Design a protein around this ligand. Structure first.
Ligand SMILES: [Mg+2]
Ligand SMILES: [Mg+2]
Ligand SMILES: [Mg+2]
Ligand SMILES: [Mg+2]
Ligand SMILES: [Mg+2]
Ligand SMILES: [Mg+2]
Ligand SMILES: [Mg+2]
Ligand SMILES: [Mg+2]
Ligand SMILES: [Mg+2]
Ligand SMILES: [Mg+2]
Ligand SMILES: [Mg+2]
Ligand SMILES: [Mg+2]
Ligand SMILES: [Mg+2]
Ligand SMILES: [Mg+2]
Ligand SMILES: [Mg+2]
Ligand SMILES: [Mg+2]
Ligand SMILES: [Mg+2]
Ligand SMILES: [Mg+2]
Ligand SMILES: [Mg+2]
Ligand SMILES: [Mg+2]
Ligand SMILES: [Mg+2]
Ligand SMILES: [Mg+2]
Ligand SMILES: [Mg+2]
Ligand SMILES: [Mg+2]
Ligand SMILES: [Mg+2]
Ligand SMILES: [Mg+2]
Ligand SMILES: [Mg+2]
Ligand SMILES: [Mg+2]
Ligand SMILES: [Mg+2]
Ligand SMILES: [Mg+2]
Ligand SMILES: [Mg+2]
Ligand SMILES: [Mg+2]
Ligand SMILES: [Mg+2]
Ligand SMILES: [Mg+2]
Ligand SMILES: [Mg+2]
Ligand SMILES: [Mg+2]
Ligand SMILES: [Mg+2]
Ligand SMILES: [Mg+2]
Ligand SMILES: [Mg+2]
Ligand SMILES: [Mg+2]
Ligand SMILES: [Mg+2]
Ligand SMILES: [Mg+2]
Ligand SMILES: [Mg+2]
Ligand SMILES: [Mg+2]
Ligand SMILES: [Mg+2]
Ligand SMILES: [Mg+2]
Ligand SMILES: [Mg+2]
Ligand SMILES: [Mg+2]
Ligand SMILES: [Mg+2]
Ligand SMILES: [Mg+2]
Ligand SMILES: [Mg+2]
Ligand SMILES: [Mg+2]
Ligand SMILES: [Mg+2]
Ligand SMILES: [Mg+2]
Ligand SMILES: [Mg+2]
Ligand SMILES: [Mg+2]
Ligand SMILES: [Mg+2]
Ligand SMILES: [Mg+2]
Ligand SMILES: [Mg+2]
Ligand SMILES: [Mg+2]
Ligand SMILES: [Mg+2]
Ligand SMILES: [Mg+2]
Ligand SMILES: [Mg+2]
Ligand SMILES: [Mg+2]
Ligand SMILES: [Mg+2]
Ligand SMILES: [Mg+2]
Ligand SMILES: [Mg+2]
Ligand SMILES: [Mg+2]
Ligand SMILES: [Mg+2]
Ligand SMILES: [Mg+2]
Ligand SMILES: [Mg+2]
Ligand SMILES: [Mg+2]
Ligand SMILES: [Mg+2]
Ligand SMILES: [Mg+2]
Ligand SMILES: [Mg+2]
Ligand SMILES: [Mg+2]
Ligand SMILES: [Mg+2]
Ligand SMILES: [Zn+2]
Lengths: 91, 77, 112, 50, 100
RNA sequence: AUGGUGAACUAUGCCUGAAUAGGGUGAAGCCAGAGGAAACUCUGGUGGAGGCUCGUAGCGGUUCUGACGUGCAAAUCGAUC
RNA sequence: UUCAAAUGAGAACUUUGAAGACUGAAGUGGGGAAAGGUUCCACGUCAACAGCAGUUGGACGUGGGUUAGUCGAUCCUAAGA
RNA sequence: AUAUGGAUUCUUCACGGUAACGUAACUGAAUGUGGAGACGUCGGCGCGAGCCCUGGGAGGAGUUAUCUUUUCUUCUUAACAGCUUAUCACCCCGGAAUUGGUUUAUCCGGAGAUGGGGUCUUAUGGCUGGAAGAGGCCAGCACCUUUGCUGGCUCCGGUGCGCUUGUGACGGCCCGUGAAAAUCCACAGGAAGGAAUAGUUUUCAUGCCAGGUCGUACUGAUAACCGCAGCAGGUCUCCAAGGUGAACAGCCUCUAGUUGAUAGAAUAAUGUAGAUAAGGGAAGUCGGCAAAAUAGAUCCGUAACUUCGGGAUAAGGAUUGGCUCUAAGGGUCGGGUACGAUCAACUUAGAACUGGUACGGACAAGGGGAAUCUGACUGUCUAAUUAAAACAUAGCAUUGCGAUGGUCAGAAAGUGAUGUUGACGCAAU
């Protein structure tokens, strides 16, 4: 029983604020409430716990990350650049 | 505050230096489902706790009661 | 029917003024105040309520024999046993690998 | 009130002590002149501002 | 498991004052005590008698002593006798009619 | 004009407390089913979202331009909200 | 709201008994915080006061009453001073 | 303050258990470290307590023309102590696809599930001690008195989407993630100190002394406070019975408390507050102001337009008492390694009968529709003539600033706000 055509979680907000504003929010809520894969123990048990703080159900590891997502695209490309640059200074 | 059952361990208490008073209480009570009998509680007032030794048996009772220190100030009933 | 009143002067429902109803040998209801609950001490290591250890309010721990405040093994009343298992292993291995990195870089200094 | 400080009880005290009518034997002294107690106060007529 | 229950009433004190007739009284009992329904179903399940100056009631069916005080009050109220005679318990389950 | 006294009312911040019948709606998440060549669509339940809604206490103060208008009252009372 | 008795110089109004009603446990019930400060209680008692009354009162007179190792304060720290 | 008993020691500073851990004890300085104190909010689920309902018996009361094995009521157990008790957590055995276990709510397992067996917290409950000697209810004698004296009984149950409160394991929410300190404990550490002719031990037991100072009355409000007052105003909070009903609503009642508010006689006009009115139906009026209409619930039906969430109880309908039947929805036991037996619940739907066609019978309880103007919304204000279209808001855009700074405070300053701050920031429109 598909419950709404399209507002998804954004249903709570009813008719208020206007479509576009709600669209934008649905995107980022779907991001934050979602359950993620833990890099450390392999199980998908990382849920968010306040802006920026991602911690793991079992094994209890907490990783700092994006405000509503585990890994922000920015930091990702940073990670690689720090890889790259570190490479140079041992070889 | 405390209840007691080792009938020797009790006897020792009744002579435990600070024990001036004691009291013997008798109660009608029932048995299993039918008849009644005669419960009897032996209460030694310590300085910090009041010890009470239930003797269920009326026979054990009488003989116990005589053994009570002949210096001890026991209140009967 | 029967109702009831606070017993301290404080009229308000604050944490320290929990109440609890009760029937007396008089055959009547009366309030009784209930101290805020103990919480179980926690393994300061993994964080779990740690087992074998009795649970009081903090000052009331001075009114109790030490066998309510420990379990036998090392880091007894303090960490969570499984936590100590880790400690033991990690300590051993690391102290060993310590030696292996010694004689390996000790070899290098002579082999170069 | 209900749970007062001593400073207030004390004051309260001294207050009820003054709360009496003229001793009638004063009315008898030579050229006594005081006819009644003019400084008589009463809880529901005049409050004593602590 | 079945159990019999006797029930005594010392009707003496107000019988020995004329105003009480035990006669038509156990009569009141014998045909108004109801049994799993109605009157006179006492199918040797309950019995009433009169040791001269006593009434004896022995049940095997549902019969409480409260019911006994209840019946007699009706009798007593029926025959004007309330004002002068209480139904009272003395010893447990042994009842008596009191005069004054 | 000079020097003083007020945040017991009230405005705003902070600190530490306390309070709020019963209803209507049924958002994410989850289970089970159905159709379809496929892509995918669909059904029934479960759940309990919301500066959501009906409405008391609460807070408010719309209208009668009602009462009163030498008042119960130097702002109150009713009903309506 | 009512009938009667008591008491009193005097009783629509005090006391007791009777009746009829109300508040309806979100109280016209049982306690407390702030504020009051003796209003509590008893005895006596009506000049004034309770916008009729009064024998009654939160009035007038005269006395009595507030008992803590554990309930609060006291100790700690908050905004802040 | 301190001794006595116990424990400990010739292997000096306890044993036992594979283990989670056990215990009546079982040395421990500096120093370090950990815990507790200590923490949001809502939701359902689970459990406790008290309340509510109820069967049996034992009493006392009320009604008895008539009827009712009846109507009312009593039947209670403190802190504190002993044994015992737990969802969670954890340990041992074991090695899992045919994946299993599993909550109302989909979470868990090779980082070891399911299973079988243990360990722990003691909220909480149980049984005993306290403690029946108390308290509750009766009966039977005594006498101006103090007031006694004497006996009895005070027992066994049942039910739950109940009510209120407490609590647990969970889940939802955040650009919001929801004090502090005193204080108490524990651990790591091992400085020291300590026995065989006799040591060590007061976190085991028992024993001895002491705990000062101030507040404690009462009111807490239609008369004890603030409003000049015994003012229809104002003024923080806990406890909370039965019916009807969704209900802490309204209406009636038990307990408790009131019966206070000048009084008598009449019932003109005009009033204030409550109601009704034939026929018409907004013609009244600035204006339907006022008032009437509507209303609960079950079922059926529901338009434009839309940001797809709504609009919507749209609109528009029918139905509803009493009584008597019927069907469906549960719990618990024993079954070698298909059924039976009983216990206890109002929910829902259907079917008859029945009446002056009445039935949400009082109470309770939305008028609807089509548009124009205007503010998006919820929220805000002129206490005491303006609640609005005014303010705010999210959203949009502009400005200033890299700290030797922006903006702002001060008479000054070894001064201050932002700032526990750093452009995803602060300040200013
Ligand atoms: Mg009752
Ligand atoms: Mg008190
Ligand atoms: Mg709270
Ligand atoms: Mg333990
Ligand atoms: Mg332990
Ligand atoms: Mg005043
Ligand atoms: Mg203020
Ligand atoms: Mg609610
Ligand atoms: Mg409704
Ligand atoms: Mg609501
Ligand atoms: Mg198919
Ligand atoms: Mg909801
Ligand atoms: Mg709202
Ligand atoms: Mg609303
Ligand atoms: Mg309603
Ligand atoms: Mg109001
Ligand atoms: Mg408001
Ligand atoms: Mg007007
Ligand atoms: Mg006028
Ligand atoms: Mg008004
Ligand atoms: Mg309203
Ligand atoms: Mg009168
Ligand atoms: Mg009434
Ligand atoms: Mg009500
Ligand atoms: Mg009143
Ligand atoms: Mg009081
Ligand atoms: Mg006062
Ligand atoms: Mg005085
Ligand atoms: Mg008085
Ligand atoms: Mg006079
Ligand atoms: Mg006066
Ligand atoms: Mg007067
Ligand atoms: Mg007069
Ligand atoms: Mg006086
Ligand atoms: Mg204290
Ligand atoms: Mg002090
Ligand atoms: Mg040992
Ligand atoms: Mg610390
Ligand atoms: Mg801490
Ligand atoms: Mg706090
Ligand atoms: Mg206690
Ligand atoms: Mg198990
Ligand atoms: Mg085992
Ligand atoms: Mg349920
Ligand atoms: Mg409440
Ligand atoms: Mg949290
Ligand atoms: Mg601890
Ligand atoms: Mg040294
Ligand atoms: Mg000790
Ligand atoms: Mg000192
Ligand atoms: Mg008091
Ligand atoms: Mg009063
Ligand atoms: Mg004044
Ligand atoms: Mg007033
Ligand atoms: Mg009163
Ligand atoms: Mg008046
Ligand atoms: Mg008149
Ligand atoms: Mg007409
Ligand atoms: Mg018409
Ligand atoms: Mg027309
Ligand atoms: Mg016209
Ligand atoms: Mg106009
Ligand atoms: Mg109108
Ligand atoms: Mg009409
Ligand atoms: Mg419409
Ligand atoms: Mg019908
Ligand atoms: Mg059935
Ligand atoms: Mg049909
Ligand atoms: Mg608006
Ligand atoms: Mg609004
Ligand atoms: Mg105004
Ligand atoms: Mg003005
Ligand atoms: Mg408005
Ligand atoms: Mg206005
Ligand atoms: Mg604006
Ligand atoms: Mg725009
Ligand atoms: Mg300087
Ligand atoms: Zn992980």
């Amino acid at each position: 029983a598909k419950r709404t055509k399209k507002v998804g979680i954004t249903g709570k907000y009813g008719v208020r604020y206007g479509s576009s504003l709600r669209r934008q929010v649905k995107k980022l809520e779907i991001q934050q409430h979602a359950r993620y894969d833990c890099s450390f123990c392999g199980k998908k048990t990382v849920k968010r716990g306040a802006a920026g703080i991602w911690t793991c159900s079992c094994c209890k590891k907490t990783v700092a990350g994006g405000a509503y997502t585990v890994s922000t695209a920015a930091a990702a490309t940073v990670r690689s650049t720090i890889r790259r640059l570190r490479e140079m200074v041992e070889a | 505050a405390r209840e007691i059952t080792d009938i020797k361990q009790f006897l020792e208490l009744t002579r435990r230096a600070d024990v001036k008073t004691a009291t013997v209480k008798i109660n009608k009570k029932l048995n299993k489902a039918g008849k009644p009998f005669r419960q009897t509680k032996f209460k030694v007032r310590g300085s910090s706790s009041l010890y009470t030794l239930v003797i269920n048996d009326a026979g054990k009772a009488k003989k116990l009661i005589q053994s009570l220190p002949p210096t001890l100030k026991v209140n009967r009933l | 029917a029967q109702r009831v009143t606070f017993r301290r002067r404080n009229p308000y429902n604050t944490r320290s003024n929990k109440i609890k109803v009760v029937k007396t040998p008089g055959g009547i209801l009366r309030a009784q105040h209930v101290k805020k609950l103990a919480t179980r001490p926690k393994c300061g290591d993994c964080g779990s309520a740690l087992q074998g250890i009795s649970t009081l309010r903090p000052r009331q721990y001075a009114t109790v024999s030490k066998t309510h405040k420990t379990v036998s093994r090392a880091y007894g009343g303090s960490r969570c046993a499984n936590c100590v298992k880790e400690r033991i292993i990690r300590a051993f291995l690391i102290e060993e690998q310590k030696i292996v990195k010694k004689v390996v870089k000790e070899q290098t200094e002579a082999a170069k | 009130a209900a749970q007062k400080s001593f400073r207030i009880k004390q004051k309260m005290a001294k207050a009820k002590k003054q709360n009496r009518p003229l001793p009638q034997w004063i009315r008898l002294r030579t050229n006594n002149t005081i006819r009644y107690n003019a400084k008589r106060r009463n809880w529901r007529r005049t409050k004593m501002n602590i | 498991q079945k159990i019999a229950k006797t029930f005594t009433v010392d009707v003496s004190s107000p019988t020995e004052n004329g105003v009480f007739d035990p006669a038509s009284y156990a009569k009141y009992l014998i045909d108004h005590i109801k049994v799993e329904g109605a009157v006179g179903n006492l199918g040797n399940a309950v019995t009433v008698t009169e040791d001269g100056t006593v009434v004896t009631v022995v049940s095997t069916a549902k019969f409480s002593g409260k019911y006994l005080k209840y019946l007699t009050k009706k009798y007593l109220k029926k025959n004007q006798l309330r004002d002068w005679i209480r139904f009272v318990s003395t010893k447990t389950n042994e009842y008596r009619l009191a005069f004054y």
